[PDB]
Amino acid sequence: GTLQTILGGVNKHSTSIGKIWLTVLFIFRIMILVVAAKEVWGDEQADFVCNTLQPGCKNVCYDHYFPISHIRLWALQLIFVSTPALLVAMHVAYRRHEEGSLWWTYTSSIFFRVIFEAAFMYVFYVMYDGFSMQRLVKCNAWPCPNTVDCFVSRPTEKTVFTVFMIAVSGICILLNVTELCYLLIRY
Amino acid sequence: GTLQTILGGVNKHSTSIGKIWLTVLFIFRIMILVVAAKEVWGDEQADFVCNTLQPGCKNVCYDHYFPISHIRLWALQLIFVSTPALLVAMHVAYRRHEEGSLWWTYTSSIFFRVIFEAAFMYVFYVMYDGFSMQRLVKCNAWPCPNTVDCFVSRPTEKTVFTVFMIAVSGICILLNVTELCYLLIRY
Amino acid sequence: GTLQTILGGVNKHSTSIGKIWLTVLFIFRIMILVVAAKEVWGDEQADFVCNTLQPGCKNVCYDHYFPISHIRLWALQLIFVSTPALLVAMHVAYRRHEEGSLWWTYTSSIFFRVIFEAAFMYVFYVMYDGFSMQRLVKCNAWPCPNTVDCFVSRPTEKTVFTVFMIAVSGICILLNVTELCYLLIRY
Amino acid sequence: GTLQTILGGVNKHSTSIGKIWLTVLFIFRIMILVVAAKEVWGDEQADFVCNTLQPGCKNVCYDHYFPISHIRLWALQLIFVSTPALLVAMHVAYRRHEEGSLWWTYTSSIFFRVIFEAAFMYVFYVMYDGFSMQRLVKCNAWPCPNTVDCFVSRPTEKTVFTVFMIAVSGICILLNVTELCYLLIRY
Amino acid sequence: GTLQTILGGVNKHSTSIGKIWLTVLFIFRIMILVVAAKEVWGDEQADFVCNTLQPGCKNVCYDHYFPISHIRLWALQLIFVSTPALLVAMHVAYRRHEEGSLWWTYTSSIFFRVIFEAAFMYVFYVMYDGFSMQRLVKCNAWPCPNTVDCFVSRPTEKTVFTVFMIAVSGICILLNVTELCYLLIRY
Amino acid sequence: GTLQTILGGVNKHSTSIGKIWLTVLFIFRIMILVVAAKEVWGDEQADFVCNTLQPGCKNVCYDHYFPISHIRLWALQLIFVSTPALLVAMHVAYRRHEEGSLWWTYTSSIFFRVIFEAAFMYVFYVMYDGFSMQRLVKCNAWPCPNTVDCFVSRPTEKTVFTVFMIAVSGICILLNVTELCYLLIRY
């Protein structure tokens, strides 16, 4: 919509790295998620195919291997890492409407961003066991009889976007560490 | 659309907690509901599967176990808890166009928000019997013969978003209580 | 879109009840209709199921029991009850561009709103025979042989939204009567 | 979008009837077409059902009885009757950028509107043979063998909106005639 | 969106015909393409029906008779004929930021518009062999065995919009020729 | 949305070629991608047809021949080549908020655009083996038995848009080289 003025206000009140590179890599991730990836995952369940005649086996096997979709995880991650930047916008506006205080908020603000980014990257790793999606999954949850072969939709294209989102997120961690280091030695 | 100016007007005329944390957690819930959850529930009935040949058994079993969808309940809840904030906006503008009066409205306004939030959380608990969705439901409503097995779509992902929305709502109750307590002891 | 300025202009030039409560309950109904209800009725015909092999029996039985959908009726009702408020906006602007006259328009304007609201509530009652939707309908229109059982989609959730819309409309009638009574005794 | 300023500019430079009633009834028709009717006709071909096994008979029978959809006819009609109002907006702005001339344009402008409205109403009558839609159509175009029964989707609801659009259009003809008569006797 | 100001800027810096009639007929074509025609072609391949059991015959026969859809051709045509008008907007703004020059650009600008309009009309004629769409096409491309009958979706309605778009385009050619002739004799 | 002001700000601070031709060819590509091409690729997997009875063979053969869709590749390319233009907008605004420096940024900025455009064109060539899409693909990945024939949806129309996007991109490379050459000889 009119997001230009929102980030425009957030654009000020930041250092060299904070003003430029963090905000660029952030709208970078939103664009990838919105204009490209969301239609890769559009038919994730409609094109899941299992080799069986058992009613209900398809529902339980899809639910077992994809407890939460990748794009829903990324959407949550962006919301979490964008709130601490939004808090200082209101907190500063609150204090300007009517160094140490603004220092502690700002230093804390970038400290949460590192925590959230590392947390979600960890969840991606354990939940999906690496960053590569397989063509074939074997499922033996009830009511599937014995073990059933099921086939994933578009596994290669989903791997490409997964690697891309992880790499950009890994960079944003490094930038946030350095800006912390600049203030740390400054004392 | 242009929601920035609406909440911007609502942003003023509030205390420290009211200005910042309540409004942040509120747009937090709207974002979760809009950008993420609404497509989790998109195929709730299209992917409901029952193990039967009886015509019409699928319609009555879905209707029996989901009398109203989760996302419709959350949409109603947000509308209810946002009106009392909107009433004071017009009521104040009405009184400014032409302490005690504004006190009683404001104290009452936050009193309704606690009532609505507690009411909807109660409905969630009794209607759905806890906050965890099951893979399998057993149904014996007419015309289903004897008891029929039916299978839910995406039960695990729906559980994740249910726990998330309940937790955020539970926090908003605590914040509203404290702001009431601050005024209560102030007398 | 940019509806804030439209109702903002309509917000002025009204009494205490007219400025606040009528306009709040009005955008209340629009929100319920738009963000929640329109996807409850999305699959009204696609999930209508009849127990027969006769080609064309499904089309005629759906058409017989739902001559016009509930959401289309509500959409028409909102359009009708919002025009008399829009007429005075242009009529006043026409008279201000170049008491009794403005009195008669305003008193008439609220008189039509009562008429339309009562009319549509009456149509809801006779056309659908109460405000509760049934799970099963029996149909014997040609070409269905003898009597055929057909099953409605999501009957319970549609009942909840029907009761909600009727109740809010019933309140708007009471508010309009009182504002008429205030002017009536004023003479 | 931002249609308020467009019609706002068109709102001026008109007489009592032209300023108010014509423009009100015009946006009235647009609202009916947009917010209500366009989803009545959404499944016009997907739910057309024919009692046959002949491949291709459904395509030719739908095309034979609905040479052009009702909503496409109404969309064309609104575009045609709105251009002459838009022409004077540019023509006047052209003459103001750098009585008789403006008289002849204005009198002609309302003369075309009567012609277009009467023309489209005539097409509706002959093409569809009255304003009532039937449940059953019989079709014998090649390749259908002998005569085939086909069934229309939502015939009753489409009849309601057809009568509504014809009635509003018939009123707009009467208003345009009277404004012509006022100028005619004025000489 | 906010197209009013774009064409508003383009509205100036043109002659009598160029200011009024060309720009009116241009937004005329955009409206027809957007609000009406794009849903006529929505199911062009989903409702293409072939009388065969050969897998893949439907894909190759649709691709053979519709190498590029009509609406995609019209969308390209509008983009091409609108760029030369946009070039002078930037070129003039470039020259005004810091007769013969502006003459040569303007005369050339209208010369390209005639070329593009005539080119696309020629492509329509040879590719589709006239402006009338047929109900039945016969196809013998591999892997279809012998010759297969296939049936087009909504052939009559597509013919109506094809004739309409060709006629409006043919008028825009005539207007551009005359404005060229006015400058030609002027010397 | 409101993209006019964004590129309007980017419109300034550029040379003759940079201001006009690069930005025109850029929004040219966005329009082709958005309004035309995205619905050519809409049914890419739904209309992929394979001549087999083996469950899961369709999923693996589609994934093998289309590791990433063409429109997703183009969407990524536009995002990459538009960031370096956006970086200087913030970097300049950063330096103006509080020759050589601005020279090095600008010269570097156009140097990355050439790199990205050449890189993506290379990926298109090797991944899809030329710019022409075939009607028939032969697939022997497990679990398909022996070799299976599969048929692509709309191969000819996809070839037309592929050639169009490659040609426009090839021009943007040439323009960027020349602007580099103008500065190079200038020293």
Side-chain angles (χ1 to χ4, degrees), chain B residues 101-127:
Chain B
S101 69
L102 185 134
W103 160 280
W104 282 107
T105 60
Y106 190 89
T107 297
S108 60
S109 177
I110 85 108
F111 190 74
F112 281 106
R113 288 207 228 87
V114 175
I115 291 307
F116 292 159
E117 292 250 323
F120 279 88
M121 279 184 53
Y122 180 68
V123 171
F124 259 105
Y125 190 69
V126 303
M127 171 170 302

PDB file of all heavy atoms in Angstrom, chain B residues 101-127:
ATOM      1  N   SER B 101     -16.337  13.231  33.288  1.00  0.00           N
ATOM      2  CA  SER B 101     -16.989  12.639  32.125  1.00  0.00           C
ATOM      3  C   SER B 101     -16.005  11.811  31.312  1.00  0.00           C
ATOM      4  O   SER B 101     -16.263  10.642  31.005  1.00  0.00           O
ATOM      5  CB  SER B 101     -17.608  13.734  31.258  1.00  0.00           C
ATOM      6  OG  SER B 101     -16.602  14.515  30.640  1.00  0.00           O
ATOM      7  N   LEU B 102     -14.857  12.398  30.971  1.00  0.00           N
ATOM      8  CA  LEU B 102     -13.853  11.660  30.217  1.00  0.00           C
ATOM      9  C   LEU B 102     -13.272  10.517  31.034  1.00  0.00           C
ATOM     10  O   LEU B 102     -12.905   9.480  30.472  1.00  0.00           O
ATOM     11  CB  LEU B 102     -12.749  12.605  29.755  1.00  0.00           C
ATOM     12  CG  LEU B 102     -11.676  12.007  28.851  1.00  0.00           C
ATOM     13  CD1 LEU B 102     -11.410  12.928  27.676  1.00  0.00           C
ATOM     14  CD2 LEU B 102     -10.401  11.757  29.634  1.00  0.00           C
ATOM     15  N   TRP B 103     -13.182  10.683  32.353  1.00  0.00           N
ATOM     16  CA  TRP B 103     -12.734   9.586  33.200  1.00  0.00           C
ATOM     17  C   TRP B 103     -13.667   8.391  33.097  1.00  0.00           C
ATOM     18  O   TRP B 103     -13.217   7.262  32.872  1.00  0.00           O
ATOM     19  CB  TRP B 103     -12.637  10.049  34.650  1.00  0.00           C
ATOM     20  CG  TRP B 103     -12.657   8.936  35.646  1.00  0.00           C
ATOM     21  CD1 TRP B 103     -13.752   8.266  36.114  1.00  0.00           C
ATOM     22  CD2 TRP B 103     -11.530   8.378  36.322  1.00  0.00           C
ATOM     23  NE1 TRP B 103     -13.373   7.316  37.024  1.00  0.00           N
ATOM     24  CE2 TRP B 103     -12.013   7.366  37.173  1.00  0.00           C
ATOM     25  CE3 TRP B 103     -10.158   8.633  36.286  1.00  0.00           C
ATOM     26  CZ2 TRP B 103     -11.173   6.611  37.981  1.00  0.00           C
ATOM     27  CZ3 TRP B 103      -9.327   7.883  37.089  1.00  0.00           C
ATOM     28  CH2 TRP B 103      -9.837   6.883  37.926  1.00  0.00           C
ATOM     29  N   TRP B 104     -14.969   8.618  33.266  1.00  0.00           N
ATOM     30  CA  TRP B 104     -15.911   7.505  33.322  1.00  0.00           C
ATOM     31  C   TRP B 104     -15.972   6.766  31.995  1.00  0.00           C
ATOM     32  O   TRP B 104     -16.069   5.534  31.963  1.00  0.00           O
ATOM     33  CB  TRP B 104     -17.291   8.010  33.733  1.00  0.00           C
ATOM     34  CG  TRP B 104     -17.377   8.274  35.192  1.00  0.00           C
ATOM     35  CD1 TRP B 104     -17.415   9.488  35.808  1.00  0.00           C
ATOM     36  CD2 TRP B 104     -17.411   7.294  36.233  1.00  0.00           C
ATOM     37  NE1 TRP B 104     -17.481   9.326  37.169  1.00  0.00           N
ATOM     38  CE2 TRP B 104     -17.479   7.987  37.455  1.00  0.00           C
ATOM     39  CE3 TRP B 104     -17.395   5.897  36.249  1.00  0.00           C
ATOM     40  CZ2 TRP B 104     -17.533   7.332  38.682  1.00  0.00           C
ATOM     41  CZ3 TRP B 104     -17.449   5.250  37.466  1.00  0.00           C
ATOM     42  CH2 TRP B 104     -17.517   5.965  38.665  1.00  0.00           C
ATOM     43  N   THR B 105     -15.924   7.502  30.886  1.00  0.00           N
ATOM     44  CA  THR B 105     -15.897   6.849  29.583  1.00  0.00           C
ATOM     45  C   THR B 105     -14.650   5.992  29.431  1.00  0.00           C
ATOM     46  O   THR B 105     -14.733   4.821  29.040  1.00  0.00           O
ATOM     47  CB  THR B 105     -15.958   7.890  28.468  1.00  0.00           C
ATOM     48  OG1 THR B 105     -14.826   8.762  28.570  1.00  0.00           O
ATOM     49  CG2 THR B 105     -17.231   8.705  28.568  1.00  0.00           C
ATOM     50  N   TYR B 106     -13.486   6.554  29.753  1.00  0.00           N
ATOM     51  CA  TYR B 106     -12.239   5.823  29.562  1.00  0.00           C
ATOM     52  C   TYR B 106     -12.169   4.601  30.466  1.00  0.00           C
ATOM     53  O   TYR B 106     -11.781   3.516  30.022  1.00  0.00           O
ATOM     54  CB  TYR B 106     -11.049   6.742  29.812  1.00  0.00           C
ATOM     55  CG  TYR B 106      -9.737   6.135  29.399  1.00  0.00           C
ATOM     56  CD1 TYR B 106      -9.255   6.296  28.110  1.00  0.00           C
ATOM     57  CD2 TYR B 106      -8.982   5.394  30.294  1.00  0.00           C
ATOM     58  CE1 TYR B 106      -8.058   5.738  27.723  1.00  0.00           C
ATOM     59  CE2 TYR B 106      -7.784   4.831  29.917  1.00  0.00           C
ATOM     60  CZ  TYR B 106      -7.325   5.006  28.630  1.00  0.00           C
ATOM     61  OH  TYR B 106      -6.128   4.447  28.248  1.00  0.00           O
ATOM     62  N   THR B 107     -12.536   4.753  31.737  1.00  0.00           N
ATOM     63  CA  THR B 107     -12.508   3.611  32.641  1.00  0.00           C
ATOM     64  C   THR B 107     -13.487   2.535  32.195  1.00  0.00           C
ATOM     65  O   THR B 107     -13.175   1.340  32.244  1.00  0.00           O
ATOM     66  CB  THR B 107     -12.818   4.054  34.065  1.00  0.00           C
ATOM     67  OG1 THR B 107     -11.796   4.949  34.513  1.00  0.00           O
ATOM     68  CG2 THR B 107     -12.875   2.854  34.993  1.00  0.00           C
ATOM     69  N   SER B 108     -14.678   2.939  31.758  1.00  0.00           N
ATOM     70  CA  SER B 108     -15.628   1.970  31.228  1.00  0.00           C
ATOM     71  C   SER B 108     -15.097   1.322  29.959  1.00  0.00           C
ATOM     72  O   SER B 108     -15.253   0.113  29.759  1.00  0.00           O
ATOM     73  CB  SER B 108     -16.967   2.648  30.957  1.00  0.00           C
ATOM     74  OG  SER B 108     -16.809   3.693  30.016  1.00  0.00           O
ATOM     75  N   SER B 109     -14.459   2.113  29.095  1.00  0.00           N
ATOM     76  CA  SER B 109     -14.000   1.610  27.806  1.00  0.00           C
ATOM     77  C   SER B 109     -13.064   0.424  27.977  1.00  0.00           C
ATOM     78  O   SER B 109     -13.212  -0.602  27.307  1.00  0.00           O
ATOM     79  CB  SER B 109     -13.310   2.729  27.029  1.00  0.00           C
ATOM     80  OG  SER B 109     -12.794   2.248  25.803  1.00  0.00           O
ATOM     81  N   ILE B 110     -12.091   0.539  28.882  1.00  0.00           N
ATOM     82  CA  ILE B 110     -11.206  -0.588  29.132  1.00  0.00           C
ATOM     83  C   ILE B 110     -11.893  -1.695  29.906  1.00  0.00           C
ATOM     84  O   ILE B 110     -11.380  -2.815  29.952  1.00  0.00           O
ATOM     85  CB  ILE B 110      -9.929  -0.160  29.884  1.00  0.00           C
ATOM     86  CG1 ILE B 110     -10.169  -0.131  31.391  1.00  0.00           C
ATOM     87  CG2 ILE B 110      -9.450   1.189  29.392  1.00  0.00           C
ATOM     88  CD1 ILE B 110      -9.494  -1.261  32.136  1.00  0.00           C
ATOM     89  N   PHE B 111     -13.036  -1.418  30.528  1.00  0.00           N
ATOM     90  CA  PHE B 111     -13.710  -2.474  31.267  1.00  0.00           C
ATOM     91  C   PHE B 111     -14.430  -3.431  30.330  1.00  0.00           C
ATOM     92  O   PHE B 111     -14.516  -4.631  30.605  1.00  0.00           O
ATOM     93  CB  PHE B 111     -14.686  -1.883  32.274  1.00  0.00           C
ATOM     94  CG  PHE B 111     -15.225  -2.893  33.225  1.00  0.00           C
ATOM     95  CD1 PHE B 111     -14.429  -3.393  34.237  1.00  0.00           C
ATOM     96  CD2 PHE B 111     -16.511  -3.376  33.091  1.00  0.00           C
ATOM     97  CE1 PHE B 111     -14.910  -4.337  35.110  1.00  0.00           C
ATOM     98  CE2 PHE B 111     -17.001  -4.323  33.964  1.00  0.00           C
ATOM     99  CZ  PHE B 111     -16.198  -4.804  34.975  1.00  0.00           C
ATOM    100  N   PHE B 112     -14.966  -2.917  29.225  1.00  0.00           N
ATOM    101  CA  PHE B 112     -15.602  -3.791  28.251  1.00  0.00           C
ATOM    102  C   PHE B 112     -14.590  -4.681  27.551  1.00  0.00           C
ATOM    103  O   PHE B 112     -14.881  -5.851  27.288  1.00  0.00           O
ATOM    104  CB  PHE B 112     -16.383  -2.967  27.232  1.00  0.00           C
ATOM    105  CG  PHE B 112     -17.715  -2.508  27.733  1.00  0.00           C
ATOM    106  CD1 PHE B 112     -17.922  -1.188  28.086  1.00  0.00           C
ATOM    107  CD2 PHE B 112     -18.758  -3.403  27.867  1.00  0.00           C
ATOM    108  CE1 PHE B 112     -19.146  -0.771  28.554  1.00  0.00           C
ATOM    109  CE2 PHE B 112     -19.984  -2.990  28.334  1.00  0.00           C
ATOM    110  CZ  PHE B 112     -20.179  -1.673  28.678  1.00  0.00           C
ATOM    111  N   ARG B 113     -13.400  -4.157  27.255  1.00  0.00           N
ATOM    112  CA  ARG B 113     -12.402  -4.950  26.552  1.00  0.00           C
ATOM    113  C   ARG B 113     -12.043  -6.206  27.328  1.00  0.00           C
ATOM    114  O   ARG B 113     -11.855  -7.274  26.740  1.00  0.00           O
ATOM    115  CB  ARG B 113     -11.154  -4.119  26.287  1.00  0.00           C
ATOM    116  CG  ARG B 113     -11.343  -3.068  25.234  1.00  0.00           C
ATOM    117  CD  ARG B 113     -10.033  -2.765  24.559  1.00  0.00           C
ATOM    118  NE  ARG B 113      -9.782  -1.334  24.479  1.00  0.00           N
ATOM    119  CZ  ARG B 113      -9.200  -0.631  25.441  1.00  0.00           C
ATOM    120  NH1 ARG B 113      -8.812  -1.229  26.556  1.00  0.00           N
ATOM    121  NH2 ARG B 113      -9.006   0.669  25.289  1.00  0.00           N
ATOM    122  N   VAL B 114     -11.948  -6.106  28.651  1.00  0.00           N
ATOM    123  CA  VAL B 114     -11.674  -7.293  29.450  1.00  0.00           C
ATOM    124  C   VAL B 114     -12.823  -8.283  29.341  1.00  0.00           C
ATOM    125  O   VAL B 114     -12.611  -9.499  29.275  1.00  0.00           O
ATOM    126  CB  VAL B 114     -11.398  -6.905  30.911  1.00  0.00           C
ATOM    127  CG1 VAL B 114     -11.245  -8.143  31.765  1.00  0.00           C
ATOM    128  CG2 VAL B 114     -10.159  -6.052  30.992  1.00  0.00           C
ATOM    129  N   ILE B 115     -14.056  -7.782  29.320  1.00  0.00           N
ATOM    130  CA  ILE B 115     -15.212  -8.670  29.281  1.00  0.00           C
ATOM    131  C   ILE B 115     -15.248  -9.451  27.975  1.00  0.00           C
ATOM    132  O   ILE B 115     -15.438 -10.671  27.971  1.00  0.00           O
ATOM    133  CB  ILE B 115     -16.506  -7.868  29.496  1.00  0.00           C
ATOM    134  CG1 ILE B 115     -16.569  -7.363  30.932  1.00  0.00           C
ATOM    135  CG2 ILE B 115     -17.711  -8.721  29.186  1.00  0.00           C
ATOM    136  CD1 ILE B 115     -16.382  -8.456  31.952  1.00  0.00           C
ATOM    137  N   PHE B 116     -15.063  -8.765  26.850  1.00  0.00           N
ATOM    138  CA  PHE B 116     -15.142  -9.437  25.559  1.00  0.00           C
ATOM    139  C   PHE B 116     -14.024 -10.455  25.394  1.00  0.00           C
ATOM    140  O   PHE B 116     -14.256 -11.573  24.924  1.00  0.00           O
ATOM    141  CB  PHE B 116     -15.105  -8.411  24.433  1.00  0.00           C
ATOM    142  CG  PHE B 116     -16.319  -7.543  24.376  1.00  0.00           C
ATOM    143  CD1 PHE B 116     -16.283  -6.321  23.738  1.00  0.00           C
ATOM    144  CD2 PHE B 116     -17.500  -7.951  24.960  1.00  0.00           C
ATOM    145  CE1 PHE B 116     -17.399  -5.522  23.687  1.00  0.00           C
ATOM    146  CE2 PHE B 116     -18.617  -7.156  24.911  1.00  0.00           C
ATOM    147  CZ  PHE B 116     -18.568  -5.942  24.275  1.00  0.00           C
ATOM    148  N   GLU B 117     -12.802 -10.089  25.780  1.00  0.00           N
ATOM    149  CA  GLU B 117     -11.679 -11.004  25.621  1.00  0.00           C
ATOM    150  C   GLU B 117     -11.872 -12.263  26.449  1.00  0.00           C
ATOM    151  O   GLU B 117     -11.575 -13.369  25.988  1.00  0.00           O
ATOM    152  CB  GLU B 117     -10.378 -10.312  26.008  1.00  0.00           C
ATOM    153  CG  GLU B 117      -9.965  -9.212  25.063  1.00  0.00           C
ATOM    154  CD  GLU B 117      -8.748  -9.582  24.257  1.00  0.00           C
ATOM    155  OE1 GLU B 117      -7.859 -10.252  24.813  1.00  0.00           O
ATOM    156  OE2 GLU B 117      -8.676  -9.213  23.068  1.00  0.00           O
ATOM    157  N   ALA B 118     -12.363 -12.119  27.677  1.00  0.00           N
ATOM    158  CA  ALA B 118     -12.601 -13.293  28.502  1.00  0.00           C
ATOM    159  C   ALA B 118     -13.750 -14.126  27.955  1.00  0.00           C
ATOM    160  O   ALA B 118     -13.733 -15.356  28.054  1.00  0.00           O
ATOM    161  CB  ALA B 118     -12.879 -12.875  29.942  1.00  0.00           C
ATOM    162  N   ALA B 119     -14.758 -13.475  27.379  1.00  0.00           N
ATOM    163  CA  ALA B 119     -15.909 -14.208  26.864  1.00  0.00           C
ATOM    164  C   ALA B 119     -15.518 -15.095  25.691  1.00  0.00           C
ATOM    165  O   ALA B 119     -15.848 -16.285  25.665  1.00  0.00           O
ATOM    166  CB  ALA B 119     -17.010 -13.234  26.456  1.00  0.00           C
ATOM    167  N   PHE B 120     -14.802 -14.538  24.717  1.00  0.00           N
ATOM    168  CA  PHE B 120     -14.432 -15.320  23.546  1.00  0.00           C
ATOM    169  C   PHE B 120     -13.464 -16.438  23.891  1.00  0.00           C
ATOM    170  O   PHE B 120     -13.543 -17.519  23.302  1.00  0.00           O
ATOM    171  CB  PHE B 120     -13.841 -14.416  22.475  1.00  0.00           C
ATOM    172  CG  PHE B 120     -14.872 -13.704  21.667  1.00  0.00           C
ATOM    173  CD1 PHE B 120     -15.374 -12.489  22.081  1.00  0.00           C
ATOM    174  CD2 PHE B 120     -15.355 -14.257  20.503  1.00  0.00           C
ATOM    175  CE1 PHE B 120     -16.327 -11.839  21.343  1.00  0.00           C
ATOM    176  CE2 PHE B 120     -16.308 -13.611  19.763  1.00  0.00           C
ATOM    177  CZ  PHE B 120     -16.795 -12.400  20.184  1.00  0.00           C
ATOM    178  N   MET B 121     -12.548 -16.210  24.830  1.00  0.00           N
ATOM    179  CA  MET B 121     -11.666 -17.290  25.251  1.00  0.00           C
ATOM    180  C   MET B 121     -12.458 -18.420  25.883  1.00  0.00           C
ATOM    181  O   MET B 121     -12.111 -19.594  25.727  1.00  0.00           O
ATOM    182  CB  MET B 121     -10.612 -16.770  26.220  1.00  0.00           C
ATOM    183  CG  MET B 121      -9.444 -16.091  25.543  1.00  0.00           C
ATOM    184  SD  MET B 121      -8.168 -15.593  26.709  1.00  0.00           S
ATOM    185  CE  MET B 121      -7.889 -17.133  27.567  1.00  0.00           C
ATOM    186  N   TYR B 122     -13.524 -18.086  26.603  1.00  0.00           N
ATOM    187  CA  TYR B 122     -14.364 -19.125  27.180  1.00  0.00           C
ATOM    188  C   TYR B 122     -15.076 -19.926  26.100  1.00  0.00           C
ATOM    189  O   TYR B 122     -15.158 -21.155  26.185  1.00  0.00           O
ATOM    190  CB  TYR B 122     -15.372 -18.506  28.139  1.00  0.00           C
ATOM    191  CG  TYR B 122     -16.266 -19.529  28.770  1.00  0.00           C
ATOM    192  CD1 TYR B 122     -15.762 -20.445  29.671  1.00  0.00           C
ATOM    193  CD2 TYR B 122     -17.609 -19.589  28.456  1.00  0.00           C
ATOM    194  CE1 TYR B 122     -16.570 -21.389  30.247  1.00  0.00           C
ATOM    195  CE2 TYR B 122     -18.427 -20.532  29.028  1.00  0.00           C
ATOM    196  CZ  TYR B 122     -17.901 -21.429  29.922  1.00  0.00           C
ATOM    197  OH  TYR B 122     -18.713 -22.373  30.498  1.00  0.00           O
ATOM    198  N   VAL B 123     -15.584 -19.251  25.070  1.00  0.00           N
ATOM    199  CA  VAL B 123     -16.276 -19.945  23.990  1.00  0.00           C
ATOM    200  C   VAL B 123     -15.332 -20.895  23.272  1.00  0.00           C
ATOM    201  O   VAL B 123     -15.704 -22.020  22.931  1.00  0.00           O
ATOM    202  CB  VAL B 123     -16.903 -18.933  23.019  1.00  0.00           C
ATOM    203  CG1 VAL B 123     -17.427 -19.637  21.796  1.00  0.00           C
ATOM    204  CG2 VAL B 123     -18.013 -18.181  23.703  1.00  0.00           C
ATOM    205  N   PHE B 124     -14.094 -20.460  23.035  1.00  0.00           N
ATOM    206  CA  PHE B 124     -13.114 -21.342  22.417  1.00  0.00           C
ATOM    207  C   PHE B 124     -12.931 -22.615  23.221  1.00  0.00           C
ATOM    208  O   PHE B 124     -12.766 -23.697  22.654  1.00  0.00           O
ATOM    209  CB  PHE B 124     -11.774 -20.633  22.275  1.00  0.00           C
ATOM    210  CG  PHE B 124     -11.517 -20.119  20.910  1.00  0.00           C
ATOM    211  CD1 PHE B 124     -11.624 -18.772  20.635  1.00  0.00           C
ATOM    212  CD2 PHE B 124     -11.166 -20.979  19.895  1.00  0.00           C
ATOM    213  CE1 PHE B 124     -11.390 -18.294  19.373  1.00  0.00           C
ATOM    214  CE2 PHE B 124     -10.932 -20.507  18.632  1.00  0.00           C
ATOM    215  CZ  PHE B 124     -11.045 -19.164  18.369  1.00  0.00           C
ATOM    216  N   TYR B 125     -12.944 -22.506  24.546  1.00  0.00           N
ATOM    217  CA  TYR B 125     -12.631 -23.668  25.359  1.00  0.00           C
ATOM    218  C   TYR B 125     -13.759 -24.689  25.346  1.00  0.00           C
ATOM    219  O   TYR B 125     -13.514 -25.884  25.164  1.00  0.00           O
ATOM    220  CB  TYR B 125     -12.313 -23.247  26.786  1.00  0.00           C
ATOM    221  CG  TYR B 125     -11.745 -24.385  27.577  1.00  0.00           C
ATOM    222  CD1 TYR B 125     -10.485 -24.880  27.291  1.00  0.00           C
ATOM    223  CD2 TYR B 125     -12.474 -24.989  28.584  1.00  0.00           C
ATOM    224  CE1 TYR B 125      -9.961 -25.933  27.994  1.00  0.00           C
ATOM    225  CE2 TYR B 125     -11.956 -26.044  29.296  1.00  0.00           C
ATOM    226  CZ  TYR B 125     -10.698 -26.512  28.995  1.00  0.00           C
ATOM    227  OH  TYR B 125     -10.171 -27.566  29.701  1.00  0.00           O
ATOM    228  N   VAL B 126     -15.000 -24.248  25.537  1.00  0.00           N
ATOM    229  CA  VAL B 126     -16.093 -25.206  25.643  1.00  0.00           C
ATOM    230  C   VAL B 126     -16.486 -25.747  24.277  1.00  0.00           C
ATOM    231  O   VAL B 126     -16.788 -26.935  24.136  1.00  0.00           O
ATOM    232  CB  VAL B 126     -17.289 -24.575  26.375  1.00  0.00           C
ATOM    233  CG1 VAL B 126     -16.858 -24.098  27.737  1.00  0.00           C
ATOM    234  CG2 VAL B 126     -17.868 -23.432  25.588  1.00  0.00           C
ATOM    235  N   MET B 127     -16.489 -24.900  23.251  1.00  0.00           N
ATOM    236  CA  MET B 127     -16.947 -25.345  21.942  1.00  0.00           C
ATOM    237  C   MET B 127     -16.002 -26.371  21.342  1.00  0.00           C
ATOM    238  O   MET B 127     -16.442 -27.338  20.716  1.00  0.00           O
ATOM    239  CB  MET B 127     -17.102 -24.152  21.008  1.00  0.00           C
ATOM    240  CG  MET B 127     -17.353 -24.537  19.575  1.00  0.00           C
ATOM    241  SD  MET B 127     -17.807 -23.123  18.573  1.00  0.00           S
ATOM    242  CE  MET B 127     -19.254 -22.585  19.461  1.00  0.00           C
TER     243      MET B 127
END
